[PDB]
Swiss-Prot record:
Keyword Cell membrane: no
GO MF terms held by the record: DNA binding
Classification lineage: Archaea, Methanobacteriati, Methanobacteriota, Methanomada group, Methanobacteria
Organism field: Methanothermobacter thermautotrophicus (strain ATCC 29096 / DSM 1053 / JCM 10044 / NBRC 100330 / Delta H) (Methanobacterium thermoautotrophicum)
Record's function text: DNA-binding protein which can interact with a randomly chosen 20-mer of double-stranded DNA.
Residues of the full protein shown: 32 to 103 of 111
UniProt KW keywords: DNA-binding
Similarity remark: Belongs to the PDCD5 family.
This protein's record includes keyword DNA-binding: yes
Top-level taxon of origin: Archaea
GO CC aspect terms: cytosol
Disulfide bonds: none
Protein name: DNA-binding protein MTH_1615
């Protein structure tokens, strides 16, 4: 029960997903709403996918932060 049952998560880790990436998004949710909203769209679609699409890593997410985050 569980663990072996499919488990759609580690599969992403093998493509470009880091424990920090997931925790990052949840972490940023309290910082900027912009990052999560846009990233979520691409993030939710990428991770939920099961072929060759994995959620963006904290590294790429960060760069995405500058992307999503307006100017200052």
């Amino acid at each position: 029960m569980r663990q072996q049952l499919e488990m759609q998560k580690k599969q992403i880790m093998m493509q470009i997903l880091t424990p920090e990436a997931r925790s990052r998004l949840a972490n940023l949710r309290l910082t900027r709403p912009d990052f999560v909203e846009q990233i979520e769209l691409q993030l939710i679609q990428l991770a939920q996918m099961g072929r060759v699409r994995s959620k963006i890593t904290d590294e790429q997410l960060k760069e995405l932060l500058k992307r999503v985050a307006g100017k200052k």
